[PDB]
Design a protein around this nucleic acid. Structure first.
Lengths: 123, 150, 112, 123, 70
RNA sequence: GGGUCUCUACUAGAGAUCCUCUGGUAGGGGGGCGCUGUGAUGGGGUAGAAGGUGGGUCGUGAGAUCCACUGGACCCGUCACA
RNA sequence: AGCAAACUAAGUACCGUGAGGGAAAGCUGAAAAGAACCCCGGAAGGGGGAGUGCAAAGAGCCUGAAACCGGGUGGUUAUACAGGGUGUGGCUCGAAAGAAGUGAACCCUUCCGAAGGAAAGGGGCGCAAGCCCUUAGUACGAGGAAGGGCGAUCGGGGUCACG
């Protein structure tokens, strides 16, 4: 997990998955690395969700650097197969970006606040 | 029984097995009353019993000619009075009315949602022709099933 | 069908002397036509201390005067002791490849 | 890898069914091929409008022949002891679990293959 | 095979989608989570002999394993 | 098919490279698939087997294998033999 | 299949005046626990609701194929043929076993390019159809390689129309 920086508690990962599920059902979502990267470049995305089991790693290795330089929060998940299925796909998805949560705004910002403690002490 | 659409508590079923009626006559009887109300079907079938009107024949219609009592169901002027076949269908509908009474359904609002005839069982006998030859004298039985709904 | 005859043929072909390639070609004959030689014919067509290379079996009909070295696939047991009793030597086709004089031998005859 | 659809996708395959497979049900239900031999047979004579005969020129490219459509080499596995004999590694095989293995051994068989990194067809 | 009721189909929200699980009818309990071995098999229709359990009737500690999946 | 080479306890397999040939009846010759039983075996599988129905994939092909449902107790891979 | 005969009576039933000839047919379940009771019916191991059992193809009882028949799903039908294979379209099915968000399908640009290979323009010849030099082996050309955009269906199955 070279591209993975900071360990995340498991009680937080499952909250990301159910955030994407509601975001899929009441908002705009972009699936796949080729589309999340364009989301950061156009600065249209607000959350970036990265799996921790991609292989090889260079598909999503560029996201952590390209996202933090533009000041956009990002979160990790243990598995890509669950991440893909939460988005309504029958296949795994390596990365997901959220355009507008809609009715899921109330808890995505909760994710943003909680991850700050883990990345705040990372120096 | 076929249907898996209407709720089970709104249906009444019956079957009558191995009766001396042909699927050739019962194909047309079952097709004429399919989808009728029970009250309309029962009173139409009784008019055929005393030959007030004819029952149409669509498929196995050799030996049946044209009637003066046919304009409702189009392409056929050919009809007849299959008495022995009608009497068994009336007996089947009596059994199905009783089963709907037990479930507590409204008899005045019952509809024939499914009816079909099937091949039953054959009794195998033989005749005695001229010149010492022998042929068949079979007897074909049949089943009939019905489902009543609202 | 023999496991050791097959591994012997594959190593003779790798040799860089036309004598050994001809032996491998000759050992691929149908079994019913495989080559053999008797002692009496080796005696007639050789001199003392020669080298005879037989691509088959050496059988014991006839007698031997002079000592010779004979290289063959197999020897009849009566035929093997006829050769040794007259002062000769016996080798197998497997050992003849590795022998240092048989690396660059001279006065070698191929017989059948 | 890119040489998998250059031979397959444009060339839709012939079925090579026996003569008169559509006139009689006793012949059509077998769904197999049998060589024509009649003196007047028309597939034997190769007349126009008559469904090609089987020939050796119809083979596939040798470099893709017999591969799984994912591009790997299929291996039928009937026991957990067949996994320990993995050749080369997980890079070039796809595992086909046997159909008759019961559900209790399947749980342990799939776990063993997952940690080795192998790819499973009927997972 | 389903007439022996060792396999149970889970009704996920009345949808044209039923999830097949292995139900250990032993263990003698009434709300334990280990009675359910989750397969990954989404049926498109319900077989005649299948036994159906509603999604709300499952123990709450197995519903999480399926609602993430859903 | 032929020439030239490599590896392997080899009745056979796996490869590299160069040249040339490609309708077919009677007929002659070379390799393979499938069925039932026997001696072995790195060997295995099963109350979830064999068989059945529909559908995926592999093979020029004879065929092989998998998926869903059905079913309720036996069955297969490899080597050799009949 | 194995003796003609694995079974309620095999040389038994049955056929011939007689010598003689000569069949068919196995399987509920571990245990009868073989379906009490109630409504219908003249009755019926008959119908419906129940109940027994791991499980009712429950007595016509293991599994339960095809032909054949009935009902339904999806296409389609009263101006017009045989029938399968192909090309282009319409409507439908698509959970798994096939590909695919590590990117299906479809659009743009550039580059290389085998055999083959123009025309318009300019000039000349012929009564004419046309031909010759240049344009020019240029544009193009099966296949093949790179990049950009959009982004979730394709392969496959059923059926109908037209070539």
């Amino acid at each position: 997990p070279s591209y993975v920086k900071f360990e995340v508690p498991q009680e937080l990962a499952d909250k990301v998955l159910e955030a994407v599920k509601k975001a899929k059902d009441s908002g705009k979502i972009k699936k796949g690395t080729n589309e999340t990267t364009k989301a950061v470049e156009r600065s249209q995305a607000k959350l970036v969700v990265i799996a921790e089991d991609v292989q090889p790693e260079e598909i999503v290795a560029h996201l952590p650097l390209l996202c933090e330089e533009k000041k956009i929060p990002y979160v990790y998940v243990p598995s890509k197969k669950s991440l893909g299925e939460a988005c309504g796909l029958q296949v795994a998805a390596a990365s997901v970006a959220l355009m507008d949560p809609g009715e899921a705004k109330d808890l995505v910002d909760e994710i943003v606040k909680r991850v700050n403690e883990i990345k705040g002490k990372s120096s | 029984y076929p249907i898996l659409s209407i709720p089970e508590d709104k249906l009444a079923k019956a079957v009558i097995k191995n009766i001396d009626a042909s699927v050739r006559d019962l194909y047309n009887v079952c097709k004429a009353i399919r989808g009728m109300n029970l009250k309309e079907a029962r009173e139409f079938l009784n008019n055929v019993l005393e030959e007030k009107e004819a029952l149409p024949f669509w498929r196995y219609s050799h030996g049946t000619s044209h009637r003066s009592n046919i304009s409702r169901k189009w392409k056929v002027k050919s009809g007849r009075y299959p008495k022995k076949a009608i009497k068994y269908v009336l007996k089947l509908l009596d059994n199905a009315e009783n089963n709907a009474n037990s479930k507590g359904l409204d008899i005045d609002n019952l509809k024939i949602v499914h009816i079909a005839a099937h091949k039953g069982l054959v009794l195998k006998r033989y005749m005695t022709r001229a010149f010492g030859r022998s042929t068949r004298k079979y007897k074909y039985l049949s089943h009939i099933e019905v489902i009543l709904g609202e | 069908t023999n496991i050791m005859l097959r591994k012997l043929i594959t190593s003779l072909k790798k040799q860089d002397k036309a004598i050994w390639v001809r032996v491998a070609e000759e050992l691929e004959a149908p079994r019913r036509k495989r080559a053999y030689i008797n002692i009496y014919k080796i005696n007639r067509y050789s001199k003392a201390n020669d080298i005879i290379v037989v691509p088959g079996k050496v059988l014991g009909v006839g007698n031997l005067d002079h000592p010779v070295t004979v290289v063959a696939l197999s020897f009849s047991k009566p035929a093997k002791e006829k050769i040794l009793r007259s002062g000769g030597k016996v080798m197998s086709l497997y050992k003849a490849i590795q022998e240092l004089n048989d690396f660059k031998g001279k006065t070698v005859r191929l017989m059948k | 890898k890119p040489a998998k659809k250059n031979m397959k996708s444009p060339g839709k395959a012939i079925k090579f069914l026996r003569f008169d497979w559509d006139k009689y049900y006793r012949i059509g239900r077998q769904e197999r091929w049998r060589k024509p031999r009649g003196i007047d047979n028309a597939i034997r004579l190769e007349l126009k409008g008559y469904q090609p005969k089987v020939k050796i020129g119809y083979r596939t490219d040798k470099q893709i022949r017999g591969l799984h459509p994912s591009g790997l080499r299929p291996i039928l596995v009937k026991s957990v002891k067949d996994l320990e004999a993995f050749a080369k590694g997980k890079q070039d095989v796809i595992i086909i679990i046997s159909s008759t293995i019961g559900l209790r051994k399947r749980i342990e068989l799939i776990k063993k293959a997952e940690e080795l990194g192998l790819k499973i067809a009927n997972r | 095979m389903l007439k022996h009721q060792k396999y149970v189909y889970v009704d996920i929200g009345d949808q044209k989608k039923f999830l097949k699980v292995r139900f250990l009818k032993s263990r003698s309990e009434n709300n334990n989570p280990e009675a359910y071995v989750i397969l990954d098999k989404i049926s498109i229709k319900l077989p005649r002999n299948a036994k159906v359990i509603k999604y709300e009737d499952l123990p709450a500690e197995v519903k999480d394993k399926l609602k993430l999946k859903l």
